Structure formats: structure tokens, C-alpha cells
Design an enzyme around this catalytic site. Structure first.
Site, mmCIF file in Angstrom:
data_model
loop_
_atom_site.group_PDB
_atom_site.id
_atom_site.type_symbol
_atom_site.label_atom_id
_atom_site.label_comp_id
_atom_site.label_asym_id
_atom_site.label_seq_id
_atom_site.Cartn_x
_atom_site.Cartn_y
_atom_site.Cartn_z
ATOM 1 N N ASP A 3 37.184 -1.596 8.774
ATOM 2 C CA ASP A 3 36.740 -2.972 9.430
ATOM 3 C C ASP A 3 37.393 -4.081 8.865
ATOM 4 O O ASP A 3 36.974 -4.817 8.012
ATOM 5 C CB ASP A 3 35.282 -3.058 9.576
ATOM 6 N N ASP A 19 40.288 -7.971 14.470
ATOM 7 C CA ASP A 19 39.220 -7.144 14.042
ATOM 8 C C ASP A 19 38.798 -5.783 14.301
ATOM 9 O O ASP A 19 38.731 -5.392 15.674
ATOM 10 C CB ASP A 19 37.752 -8.266 14.737
HETATM 11 C C1 LIG Z 1 29.781 -9.294 8.826
HETATM 12 C C2 LIG Z 1 30.173 -10.616 9.437
HETATM 13 C C3 LIG Z 1 31.224 -11.149 8.408
HETATM 14 C C4 LIG Z 1 30.155 -10.893 10.929
HETATM 15 C C5 LIG Z 1 29.233 -11.354 11.401
HETATM 16 C C6 LIG Z 1 29.570 -11.584 12.923
HETATM 17 C C7 LIG Z 1 30.545 -11.098 13.554
HETATM 18 C C8 LIG Z 1 31.831 -10.514 12.814
HETATM 19 C C9 LIG Z 1 32.961 -10.076 13.424
HETATM 20 N N1 LIG Z 1 33.256 -8.753 13.187
HETATM 21 C C10 LIG Z 1 32.066 -7.832 13.589
HETATM 22 C C11 LIG Z 1 32.345 -6.342 13.116
HETATM 23 O O1 LIG Z 1 32.329 -6.423 11.721
HETATM 24 C C12 LIG Z 1 31.424 -5.426 13.690
HETATM 25 C C13 LIG Z 1 31.329 -3.975 12.881
HETATM 26 C C14 LIG Z 1 30.603 -2.962 13.413
HETATM 27 C C15 LIG Z 1 29.059 -3.371 13.490
HETATM 28 C C16 LIG Z 1 30.812 -1.528 12.515
HETATM 29 C C17 LIG Z 1 29.964 -0.560 13.099
HETATM 30 C C18 LIG Z 1 30.341 -0.085 14.537
HETATM 31 C C19 LIG Z 1 31.633 0.417 15.007
HETATM 32 C C20 LIG Z 1 32.134 1.028 16.034
HETATM 33 C C21 LIG Z 1 31.434 0.407 17.176
HETATM 34 C C22 LIG Z 1 32.125 -0.955 17.526
HETATM 35 C C23 LIG Z 1 31.399 -1.717 18.614
HETATM 36 C C24 LIG Z 1 31.506 -3.403 18.393
HETATM 37 O O2 LIG Z 1 32.503 -3.928 19.045
HETATM 38 N N2 LIG Z 1 30.516 -4.179 17.538
HETATM 39 C C25 LIG Z 1 29.273 -3.416 17.128
HETATM 40 C C26 LIG Z 1 31.059 -5.537 17.628
HETATM 41 C C27 LIG Z 1 30.148 -6.398 18.330
HETATM 42 C C28 LIG Z 1 30.762 -5.802 16.005
HETATM 43 O O3 LIG Z 1 29.947 -6.648 15.784
HETATM 44 N N3 LIG Z 1 31.563 -5.096 14.981
HETATM 45 C C29 LIG Z 1 31.577 -10.578 11.551
#
Ligand SMILES: CC(C)c1cccc(CNC[C@@H](O)[C@@H]2C[C@H](C)CCCCCCCCC(=O)N(C)[C@@H](C)C(=O)N2)c1
EC number: 3.4.23.46
Length: 377
Positions: A35, A220
Site C-alpha cells: 500500500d 496509491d
Molecule cells: C491510512 C491513512 C493515511 C489514510 C486515510 C484515508 C485515505 C488514505 C488513502 N489510501 C487508502 C488506502 O490506504 C486504503 C488501503 C486498504 C484499506 C487496504 C485493504 C484493502 C485492499 C484491497 C481493496 C481495496 C479497496 C479500496 O480501494 N479501498 C479500501 C480504499 C477506499 C482504501 O481506503 N484503501 C489513507
């Protein structure tokens, strides 16, 4: 010796890409989601219906309790747990072992996925967005500090069930073709970049380029979709609908809810446009573009009924926290996270996405005036 890391990633469509790791002494093998959109290293450490296995701290002679809790709320999903340190290695990675921070996940909500084959997450972004705060050194910072691994990594995420490569410490030239084009890392927190222009089938969206980066734009690998700020999402969907108007789709398809199917091998790729994202370049008034094919943003999904058709979900969704260049964007590109030089490189991947009359591309140079005005403040 990057050949040892080629093909070290696996995954399932829409369920991320994972790498094999070991934690503790004796080594406990776990599959870890890669990630670039977060900065915590965390593993399941308590039973959970969807976990095939988990980290057992009591069986590790090198485990150290930090006596501090932690929780991470993502855009979707969250977990909480207990901080500690342990020895960590990457079998199909550099030949090193490092003591790293590890969050032992004890409770989670809509985080782990039923039948995914991964049990933890490796946040590769910077300390500024680590939880509970930026004093928790991220894994990659520990790796660089404790070994001679150069301060960069690259990701080759491949489509169709899916695989790829995470080259730790460098660039493997056999994994891409053509030239690498670099965009500055605007600020070391997320891998934040600046988008300076958007075109759909060669037609400029003609928005204030600040709209593209409101309130940030990030790269991301932990996000499936291309996520766009509300205003940009509406313009892009309006344009994509028009280009494909010879066929009718449920309104839930454009919201990423319902899937669309076609007779196996009759998907009308030609009616869906290409999307060009222009990124800020390395020299004054210079940008470059990456071109995204519909085979990227129409994500293939297992036919829940009779696997007789080709079924897809619309992998572009609306965001309220800026643009997210997720996995479907990175797929078919080789992406270099050049932390040492504060830049991110893009090149056409050796596993590039194919179309009959079109091809994904990374092209430059382009002239773009006033690119600094495109960043949101
Ligand atoms: C952790 C902090 C720094 C943070 C807060 C808010 C946004 C972000 C940006 N990156 C988000 C990312 O880290 C975060 C990582 C996931 C939960 C990891 C587990 C699931 C992976 C496979 C399914 C993916 C589905 C999806 O697109 N999701 C699950 C988005 C929607 C999401 O969220 N992804 C970071």
C-alpha cells in the site's frame, strides 16, 4: 540482483497486491498487502473469520511490546491494535533482516476480505501520515536506515488472477519499455503529485487545473479505483457516458455498484474513451502524459452466475479527499517511487494492457504553463 524480486507479487482483482514476508524468530510467514497510500506496517494478530493465519507474538523470541495502542481509519475500512517491534524479512526481496515497527491487529472493521490470501498491510508512504503520529518510523524508513538498500522502490502491477513485481532498492530495466517520465513528489506524506491537464479521447476537460488536485492527488496502490474530486468525476462520467451512448447502462453501473456483462469476447472496448492524465514534469513549463485505456478502468469481475459472459465494474468513483491514482491506473505502468530524488517515474510496463487499435502510453515532453497554479493550498 533484482531478478529475485521479479514476479514477487500476487493478488485477486479488486483485492490488492500482496508480497510474502516473515516476522519474528522463528520466522512466521505472512502475505502482506502493498500500500503506497498509507504508512503503517500492520498484521492480523488475533483470530478473524477471514484470516487463514495470523501473527502469534508469544511464539517470537524477538518480539518487543511497545505498550502503546494504535488505530488506522482508511477511506474504507479500519483496524485497531497494539504496537511492538520484531525482526522482518522479505523472502523474494533483499537479503536482509530489519527490526521494524509492527501493529498487531486485534480488531478490525471491513478491512480484511473474505478469501483474499493476505493477512496484513505494508504502508510504504512517509512518516507524516503514520498512526498514531509521525514518530512511528515506517517499514521502508527502517529498511533504508538499517541496511544498504537504496532509498527507492518500484512497482510493476499487472492485470489479468493477477501478479506483479515490487523491486526493493532499484529499477529493473527488463520490466518496462521506452523512457521513464518523472513527476515531482510535491510533499513527502502521501506520494502526492500534481495533475496539470486531463483529456478524454483527446478532448480537454477544460477545468481549472486546481480542481484536479482538490485537495490533493496521490499515487496509491492500496486503492482499487481511479478516484476523482466530485466536480472532476461529474465531468469525466458525463464525457464517458456520451462516448459510449450507443449502449445503455444502469445508473448503478456508473456509481460502481452494479456490474455490466457482455457475451464472452464481445465487449465493445471501442465505445469507451481513453483518459489522459498530464503530470507536472522535471523541467520548467514541462509535463508528460499517461494514457489510460478502458481495459484499465473497466475492472473484470467474476461472473457470480454462469461464467458465460465477460462482466465488469466501473472502476472510477467519486472522492471527497482528492484524486487517487489507484491500482487500476498503475496497472500496465512501471512506477518508480524514487524517494531519494523526491520523484515518481512512469513507463509503459512489460505487462502492458493491450487493445487492438489503441495502446496505453507515457508520452512527453509537453509544454504546460503555470503548472504551480495547479496545486491546491
Ligand atoms: C491510512 C491513512 C493515511 C489514510 C486515510 C484515508 C485515505 C488514505 C488513502 N489510501 C487508502 C488506502 O490506504 C486504503 C488501503 C486498504 C484499506 C487496504 C485493504 C484493502 C485492499 C484491497 C481493496 C481495496 C479497496 C479500496 O480501494 N479501498 C479500501 C480504499 C477506499 C482504501 O481506503 N484503501 C489513507
Amino acid at each position: 540482483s533484482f531478478v529475485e524480486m521479479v514476479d514477487n507479487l500476487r493478488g485477486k482483482s479488486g483485492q490488492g497486491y500482496y508480497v510474502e514476508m516473515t516476522v519474528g524468530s522463528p520466522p512466521q510467514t505472512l502475505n502482506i498487502l502493498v500500500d503506497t497510500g498509507s504508512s503503517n506496517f500492520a498484521v492480523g494478530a488475533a483470530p478473524h473469520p477471514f484470516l487463514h493465519r495470523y501473527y502469534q507474538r508469544q511464539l517470537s523470541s524477538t518480539y518487543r511490546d511497545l505498550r502503546k495502542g494504535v488505530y488506522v481509519p482508511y477511506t474504507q475500512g479500519k483496524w485497531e491494535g497494539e504496537l511492538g517491534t520484531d525482526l522482518v524479512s522479505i523472502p523474494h526481496g533483499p537479503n536482509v533482516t530489519v527490526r521494524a515497527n509492527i501493529a498487531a491487529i486485534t480488531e478490525s472493521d471491513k478491512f480484511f476480505i473474505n478469501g483474499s490470501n493476505w493477512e496484513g498491510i505494508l504502508g510504504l508512504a512517509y512518516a507524516e501520515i503514520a498512526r498514531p503520529d509521525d514518530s512511528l518510523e515506517p517499514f521502508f524508513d527502517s529498511l533504508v536506515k538499517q541496511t544498504h538498500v537504496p532509498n527507492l522502490f518500484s512497482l510493476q502491477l499487472c492485470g489479468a488472477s493477477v501478479g506483479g513485481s515490487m523491486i526493493i532498492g532499484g529499477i529493473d530495466h527488463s520490466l518496462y519499455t521506452g523512457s521513464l517520465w518523472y513527476t515531482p513528489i510535491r510533499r513527502e506524506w502521501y506520494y502526492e503529485v500534481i495533475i496539470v491537464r486531463v483529456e478524454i479521447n483527446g478532448q480537454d476537460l477544460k477545468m481549472d487545473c486546481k480542481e484536479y488536485n482538490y485537495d490533493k492527488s496521490i499515487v496509491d496502490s492500496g486503492t482499487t479505483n481511479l478516484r476523482l474530486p466530485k466536480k472532476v468525476f461529474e465531468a469525466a462520467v458525463k464525457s464517458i457516458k456520451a462516448a459510449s451512448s450507443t449502449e445503455k447502462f444502469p445508473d448503478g453501473f456508473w456509481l460502481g455498484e452494479q456490474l455490466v456483462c457482455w457475451q464472452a469476447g464481445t465487449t465493445p472496448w471501442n465505445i469507451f474513451p481513453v483518459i489522459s492524465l498530464y503530470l507536472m514534469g522535471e523541467v520548467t513549463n514541462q509535463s508528460f502524459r499517461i494514457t489510460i485505456l478502458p481495459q484499465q478502468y473497466l475492472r473484470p469481475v467474476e461472473d457470480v452466475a454462469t461464467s458465460q459472459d465477460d462482466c465488469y465494474k466501473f472502476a472510477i468513483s467519486q472522492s471527497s479527499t482528492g484524486t487517487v491514482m489507484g491500482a487500476v491506473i498503475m496497472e500496465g505502468f512501471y512506477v518508480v517511487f524514487d524517494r531519494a530524488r523526491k520523484r515518481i517515474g512512469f513507463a509503459v510496463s512489460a505487462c502492458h494492457v493491450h487493445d487492438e487499435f489503441r495502446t496505453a502510453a507515457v508520452e512527453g515532453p509537453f509544454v504546460t504553463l503555470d503548472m504551480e497554479d495547479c496545486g491546491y493550498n
